[PDB]
Amino acid sequence: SHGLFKKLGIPGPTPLPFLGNILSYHKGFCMFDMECHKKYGKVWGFYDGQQPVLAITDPDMIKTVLVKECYSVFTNRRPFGPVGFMKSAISIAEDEEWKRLRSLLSPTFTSGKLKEMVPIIAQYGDVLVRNLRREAETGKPVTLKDVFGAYSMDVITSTSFGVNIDSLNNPQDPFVENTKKFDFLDPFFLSITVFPFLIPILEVLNICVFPREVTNFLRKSVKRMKESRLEDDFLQLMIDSQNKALSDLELVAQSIIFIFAGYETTSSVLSFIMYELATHPDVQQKLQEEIDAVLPNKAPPTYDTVLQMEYLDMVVNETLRLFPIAMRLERVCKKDVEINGMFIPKGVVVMIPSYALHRDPKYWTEPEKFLPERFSKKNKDNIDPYIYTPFGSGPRNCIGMRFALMNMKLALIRVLQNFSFKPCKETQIPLKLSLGGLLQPEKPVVLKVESR
Amino acid sequence: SHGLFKKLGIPGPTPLPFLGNILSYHKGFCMFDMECHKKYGKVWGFYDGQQPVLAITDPDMIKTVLVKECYSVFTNRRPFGPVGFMKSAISIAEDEEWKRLRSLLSPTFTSGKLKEMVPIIAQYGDVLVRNLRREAETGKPVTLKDVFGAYSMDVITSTSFGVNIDSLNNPQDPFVENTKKFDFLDPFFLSITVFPFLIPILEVLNICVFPREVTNFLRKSVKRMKESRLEDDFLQLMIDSQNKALSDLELVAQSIIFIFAGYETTSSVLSFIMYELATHPDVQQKLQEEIDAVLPNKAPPTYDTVLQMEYLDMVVNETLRLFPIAMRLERVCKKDVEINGMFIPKGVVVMIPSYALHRDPKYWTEPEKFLPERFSKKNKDNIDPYIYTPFGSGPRNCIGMRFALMNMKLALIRVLQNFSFKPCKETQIPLKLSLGGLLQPEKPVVLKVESR
Ligand code: HEM
Ligand code: HEM
Ligand SMILES: CC(C)(C)OC(=O)N[C@@H](CSC[C@@H](Nc1ccccc1)C(=O)NCc1cccnc1)Cc1c[nH]c2ccccc12
Ligand SMILES: CC(C)(C)OC(=O)N[C@@H](CSC[C@@H](Nc1ccccc1)C(=O)NCc1cccnc1)Cc1c[nH]c2ccccc12
Numbered sequence: 001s002h003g004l005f006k007k008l009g010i011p012g013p014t015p016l017p018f019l020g021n022i023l024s025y026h027k028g029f030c031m032f033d034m035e036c037h038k039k040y041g042k043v044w045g046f047y048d049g050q051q052p053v054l055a056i057t058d059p060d061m062i063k064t065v066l067v068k069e070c071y072s073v074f075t076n077r078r079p080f081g082p083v084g085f086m087k088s089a090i091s092i093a094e095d096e097e098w099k100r101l102r103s104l105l106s107p108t109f110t111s112g113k114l115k116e117m118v119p120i121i122a123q124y125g126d127v128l129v130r131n132l133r134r135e136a137e138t139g140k141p142v143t144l145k146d147v148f149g150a151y152s153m154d155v156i157t158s159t160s161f162g163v164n165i166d167s168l169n170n171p172q173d174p175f176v177e178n179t180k181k182f183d184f185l186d187p188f189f190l191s192i193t194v195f196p197f198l199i200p201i202l203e204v205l206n207i208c209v210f211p212r213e214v215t216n217f218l219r220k221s222v223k224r225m226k227e228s229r230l231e232d233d234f235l236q237l238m239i240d241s242q243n244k245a246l247s248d249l250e251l252v253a254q255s256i257i258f259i260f261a262g263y264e265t266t267s268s269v270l271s272f273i274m275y276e277l278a279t280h281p282d283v284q285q286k287l288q289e290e291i292d293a294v295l296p297n298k299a300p301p302t303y304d305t306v307l308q309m310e311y312l313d314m315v316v317n318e319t320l321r322l323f324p325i326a327m328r329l330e331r332v333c334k335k336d337v338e339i340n341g342m343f344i345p346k347g348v349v350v351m352i353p354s355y356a357l358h359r360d361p362k363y364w365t366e367p368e369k370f371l372p373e374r375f376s377k378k379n380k381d382n383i384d385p386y387i388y389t390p391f392g393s394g395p396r397n398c399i400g401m402r403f404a405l406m407n408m409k410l411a412l413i414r415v416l417q418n419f420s421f422k423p424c425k426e427t428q429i430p431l432k433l434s435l436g437g438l439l440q441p442e443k444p445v446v447l448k449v450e451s452r
Numbered sequence: 453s454h455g456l457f458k459k460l461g462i463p464g465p466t467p468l469p470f471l472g473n474i475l476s477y478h479k480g481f482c483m484f485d486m487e488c489h490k491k492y493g494k495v496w497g498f499y500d501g502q503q504p505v506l507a508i509t510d511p512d513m514i515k516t517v518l519v520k521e522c523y524s525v526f527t528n529r530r531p532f533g534p535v536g537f538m539k540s541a542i543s544i545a546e547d548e549e550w551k552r553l554r555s556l557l558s559p560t561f562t563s564g565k566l567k568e569m570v571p572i573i574a575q576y577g578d579v580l581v582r583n584l585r586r587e588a589e590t591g592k593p594v595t596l597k598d599v600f601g602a603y604s605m606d607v608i609t610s611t612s613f614g615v616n617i618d619s620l621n622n623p624q625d626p627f628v629e630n631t632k633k634f635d636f637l638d639p640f641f642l643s644i645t646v647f648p649f650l651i652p653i654l655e656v657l658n659i660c661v662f663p664r665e666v667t668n669f670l671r672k673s674v675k676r677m678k679e680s681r682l683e684d685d686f687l688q689l690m691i692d693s694q695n696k697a698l699s700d701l702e703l704v705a706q707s708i709i710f711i712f713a714g715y716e717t718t719s720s721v722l723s724f725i726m727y728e729l730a731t732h733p734d735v736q737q738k739l740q741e742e743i744d745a746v747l748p749n750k751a752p753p754t755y756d757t758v759l760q761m762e763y764l765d766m767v768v769n770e771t772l773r774l775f776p777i778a779m780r781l782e783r784v785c786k787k788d789v790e791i792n793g794m795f796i797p798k799g800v801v802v803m804i805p806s807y808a809l810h811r812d813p814k815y816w817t818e819p820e821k822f823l824p825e826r827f828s829k830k831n832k833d834n835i836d837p838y839i840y841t842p843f844g845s846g847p848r849n850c851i852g853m854r855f856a857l858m859n860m861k862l863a864l865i866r867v868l869q870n871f872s873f874k875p876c877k878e879t880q881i882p883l884k885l886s887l888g889g890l891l892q893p894e895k896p897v898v899l900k901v902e903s904r
């Protein structure tokens with residue numbers, strides 16, 4: 001099984017029996033992809049256990065996988081388990097059941113439904129400022145992921161179920177616990193990659209990478225909410241759709257996906273931004289000046305004034321370049337195909353190393369340096385959309401891209417209208433990324449906060 | 453494998469392929485043991501999957517297993533897994549490592565160390581009264597397991613680490629969460645009994661019936677406490693012992709056992725008592741009168757005045773007869789032996805059905821009726837210590853029996869000095885026991901509480 005890439009003429013590191021190349025994940029996926037990109041070039045291979053993985057870095061070949069041949073060949077991602085009833089979640093579902101779900105859930109994320117969400121997402125930005133001010137009037141540094149997490153949590157439960165909580169002042173509420181509760185290099189998932197034949201063992205055991213309790217809490221919580229608005233957010237838009245149509249437990253599963261999607265991602269991207277803003281204080285001033293020009297007297301951001309801000313889009317995009325939280329994009333090749341002159345055998349995982357491509361000196365000058373001007377309208381043209389892909393690409397890209405950018409930008413506008421963020425003695429500079437299996441900081445980001 | 457009891461001449465229900473007799477657990481262990489005791493007699497057999505289990509009800513034969521041949525033959529209980537680092541917990545450990553631990557932990561539970569604990573256990577009884585009074589001055593019924601659990605939780609963290617919390621008013625404290633977080637007939641453990649060859653699968657996966665997070669919280673919490681009192685309760689008595697000696701992670705493991713031991717047990721026995729007191733109001737008055745005679749002016753109970761109360765011991769004992777939380781006692785037979793004229797082959801689990809023996813009409817008149825006078829000093833003599841065994845018997849019996857009886861009695865004395873407990877319209881009468889795999893009520897116990 002370990003002779004595949006040795007046959008196809010594709011180069012790669014020598015796999016060990018059973019382990020494959022996974023000992024090379026000791027420095028984390030990011031550092032391993034970079035070294036492979038360096039040693040090997042435009043295409044290489046390795047083995048997650050006995051699983052072949054082909055990394056590709058040609059943007060034409062990437063467009064073929066993510067777009068051109070998405071429906072025919074590269075339709076699903078690597079099988080993930082054990083998942084239990086979470087098999088019906090859009091990001092996990094496969095082939096025609098993914099296609100059905102993606103459609104039933106697509107109108108949820110239009111710019112029209114997104115503009116209805118602005119006045120609601122704009123209300124918890126104010127709850128955020130007062131929690132910062134209480135820690136700004138105090139003095140003690142601030143841990144961003146705490147305060148940003150509490151905010152991102154407040155946007156989720158409101159934009160997805162209607163529930164309204166100040167989590168930072170209500171850590172022991174009715175749903176704030178369950179909803180705060182996957183390291184792909186921890187003892188568990190490495191044991192998967194080596195023993196992926198033990199996934200089916202756990203699926204007959206009802207054991208789940210989603211704890212059987214959080215899921216049990218929201219499965220019944222939804223069916224209370226469902227039989228409450230009926231008759232008298234995401235949950236509403238999904239229930240209206242099933243009026244081939246969406247099921248009840250299918251509806252719970254997409255809710256659970258939308259929560260992790262907008263909790264740790266939204267709150268962890270904001271912390272990469274605030275770290276970079278705090279360590280590049282001119283970019284902070286330029287941003288503060290642009291907000292006050294569009295929104296004078298700290299005017300409330302509207303859906304339209306947010307898209308009006310260009311230097312804010314440049315800042316977000318550049319932070320997503322340095323910290324693309326997905327790290328890699330992946331598609332399971334389901335047929336023997338020949339894309340851009342290369343034969344891909346059936347069953348091979350095709351992987352795009354986003355992190356490595358975002359930091360490639362062949363496409364980016366000074367790629368470690370935080371330089372937002374790359375995304376100025378003068379230079380935004382010269383950027384290859386299949387090299388910089390923080391939301392993936394093609395029919396299977398991030399369905400909540402628009403919502404995530406709008407959610408994070410409404411947060412930043414209000415927060416930078418009232419605060420400046422300074423490095424602390426305890427602030428990790430330069431921020432070390434987690435040697436583990438997540439795109440997260442080694443030490444969490446602590447910063448000083450001052451009231452304008 | 454299913455031909456064993458068919459060969460030995462022992463009667464039993466016909467086992468199905470792979471499942472054995474476990475479909476017969478549908479009404480719970482209790483009802484199944486009673487029916488088997490009824491249909492079959494003094495000795496019978498069944499199969500937990502391919503595991504042979506021999507039930508015995510002769511008190512001479514039981515004394516042989518629990519006492520006479522405990523060290524030689526019947527030393528450990530049924531293998532339990534997956535357990536991870538919790539293998540070193542006294543109740544799980546085996547043979548010489550159990551013997552070493554039982555010794556290193558025995559002086560902890562002397563009546564001398566227990567008398568030092570009284571003034572501390574007496575302090576949270578007052579915290580209990582004021583939480584009841586707030587729900588007694590209000591009116592709304594009271595769920596006993598909530599308020600009793602909060603109390604039992606407060607005694608644990610104090611008598612085992614020194615930490616002091618009012619959990620009922622601090623549900624979101626630093627340790628109250630972790631510490632509040634096994635149904636042997638849920639989807640998981642039935643899958644064990646049928647696939648017990650999958651336990652070793654999980655032990656190479658670090659997966660644990662103890663969540664990897666609660667254990668991680670207390671493993672480090674202990675090693676903070678350890679290097680804090682050093683230098684400047686159970687944890688202290690264990691640390692003094694290791695001065696063949698107790699280890700560090702061994703010390704964490706016994707702490708985790710002492711917590712579940714005194715949290716759900718203590719708080720669930722108190723609720724069986726309060727249910728029975730509320731549904732037999734004369735027994736409540738007789739008890740209230742005896743406390744006021746020993747402790748006039750609601751005098752504070754002392755270690756000695758608690759043992760002075762006889763009708764209180766009768767009440768506890770009779771409640772433990774009707775609801776012996778263990779349900780069964782068990783020992784793995786490690787040699788071919790012939791005890792009381794019966795050949796026991798190696799590897800067979802020997803089981804004593806406590807619940808069924810506590811309700812046997814051959815030893816108890818009106819065994820369902822709650823009749824505390826069975827344990828009056830006139831009739832306490834005529835009770836067979838190998839028929840009524842709420843704490844087991846012999847070298848492997850409950851190490852915290854004395855502590856549990858003292859802990860529960862200090863609770864009852866203070867609570868009955870200030871409250872009467874009435875049935876509510878919502879009170880489940882007659883209380884149905886959980887059809888599941890726990891000795892717990894179907895519906896939780898709700899009762900009215902009135903201030904004396
Ligand atoms: C900064 C925020 C976010 C980033 C950078 C991000 C990034 C990504 C990426 C890279 C993918 C895979 C794309 C591919 O394979 O081509 C993805 C998929 C997905 N995202 Fe996001 N995401 C973010 C937030 C969100 C939010 C707020 C939601 C809310 C619903 C969401 C919902 C989803 C779903 C459902 C998928 C799977 C789509 C499918 O398989 O059909 N994401 N995201
Ligand atoms: C009403 C309260 C309790 C009851 C009815 C009870 C009952 C039992 C029973 C039946 C056993 C098995 C005995 C045997 O196999 O012969 C046992 C064992 C045990 N109990 Fe308790 N228990 C109670 C509370 C506690 C408490 C508060 C502790 C605190 C440390 C504790 C610690 C233990 C330990 C460590 C074992 C295992 C002993 C060994 O395997 O060496 N128990 N209990
Ligand atoms: C297994 C691997 C790495 C080879 O393959 C994956 O990718 N398995 C995905 C696992 S199940 C999809 C789901 N995970 C999740 C995680 C924790 C709790 C609940 C759900 C998901 O979508 N959460 C929202 C999200 C996260 C990040 C960006 N946006 C949206 C993990 C995954 C990471 N980023 C993805 C992007 C699209 C689809 C899946 C993923
Ligand atoms: C597996 C079976 C049923 C065939 O065999 C058992 O019995 N496996 C015992 C499991 S591991 C011992 C440990 N469980 C535990 C449970 C949850 C969290 C943490 C620990 C334990 O001791 N908790 C204290 C206790 C509970 C009840 C009375 N007193 C003390 C389950 C068990 C039930 N009652 C016992 C009495 C003695 C020893 C073990 C048990």
